[PDB]
Design a protein around this ligand. Structure first.
Ligand SMILES: c1ccc2c(-c3cn[nH]c3)ccnc2c1
Ligand SMILES: c1ccc2c(-c3cn[nH]c3)ccnc2c1
Ligand SMILES: [Ca+2]
Ligand SMILES: [Ca+2]
Lengths: 113, 113, 116, 116
């Protein structure tokens, strides 16, 4: 699957490989509870984060560790990370969170199908 | 595959389906010669444009018919089309031209692997 | 003006007007503390958030309330907000412009950093 | 200033300075004819391309020479240019700002259209 993340690199023109991604769900006390995590693959994709039964309606945060990514490439970055925060609302739906990274900018879109 | 195009819609949060795409190669006389064309699929992707033997080094233009796309959705658009112009340079390489559409803006990136 | 925010609307081809913006700064105990807030003008710009004296070194978060913007236009948007989190002034004072481009299911930000 | 161009660099977090910009207008015979050209300033802005009298209805193309920009910085870029093609002034005169954001393998443009 219900949740996939895809990351691209606008400087090198490539998938952003080996990027750490953590997903959190907002709790009743307004704190962020860990939900799923992983590293992007050689295609820049992170699959297998969750299952249909685990992924309920609510507010989610996808934190992408952009700073570590740029540093591993020897490139100087602006942001600490990228945080993408959205509501999941329930008919049949799959969500892709896509992000395009540059050192001083990022862009994100949602593909919901 | 060597050349793929992928199109997303930033307003609806979906693949951009049924978008006409024409590819041209620049000729010796500096005119644009037709090279390949097709319509994006239900995943927003256009595969099968060319073959390894046909796709040689040179300057290519990918013209995406964004105006017709928005009009078919009932949305008022700014651009006539989106034109993405690049050089192909030869080791082993596959090119993806990705575009993210909004009515008054578009973004494009290249994924070369 | 060491910190400025500029917001554009990619659907209408316009400045994004009356957008609320909240800035936080990380405290010594690693929590987010309020720092400044304001709203974009008719030009989509927000000036006056802070001063050279107040805008010290630190880790800052700029949260742009994109959800309320779209809802006010009668549109149900995907994201709760657009944001940037960054370390400021580590090599001395700088001027920062955060430029954001909005659609209902997408946003982009960029930083423009200049040395005064 | 009915037509303005503003360009930012997403790698350096800076205005994109000294960027050449060429504007064309479609002629009655459907070819592109030269209309105006200029280069971005130290702020990444280009003013003065045209006038209210000269900027009539038509189909315009704004070609931003991104290739030369990156090459000047010692970088080999993907695209030949960034562009916009649009019909202008169809419902009366408007003011147009073309805002571009550049990386070596990516670009974004947006239009800001206001009614004078
Ligand atoms: C943000 C996120 C995604 C992109 C894409 C893209 C199309 N397919 N997969 C990604 C293209 C251009 N700009 C983007 C900005
Ligand atoms: C505000 C918001 C965005 C920008 C951009 C930009 C173009 N595409 N992505 C963003 C360029 C130049 N000035 C801007 C001011
Ligand atoms: Ca310091
Ligand atoms: Ca008219």
């Amino acid at each position: 699957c219900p949740l996939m993340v895809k990351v691209l690199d606008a400087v090198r023109g490539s998938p952003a490989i080996n990027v750490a991604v953590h997903v959190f769900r907002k709790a009743a006390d307004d704190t962020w509870e860990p939900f799923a995590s992983g590293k992007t693959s050689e295609s820049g994709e992170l699959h297998g984060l969750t299952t249909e039964e685990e992924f309920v309606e609510g507010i989610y945060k996808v934190e992408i560790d952009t700073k570590s990514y740029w540093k591993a490439l020897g490139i100087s970055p602006f942001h600490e990370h990228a945080e993408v925060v959205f509501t999941a609302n329930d008919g049949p739906r799959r969500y892709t969170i896509a992000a395009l990274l540059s050192p001083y900018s990022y862009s994100t879109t949602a593909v919901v199908t």
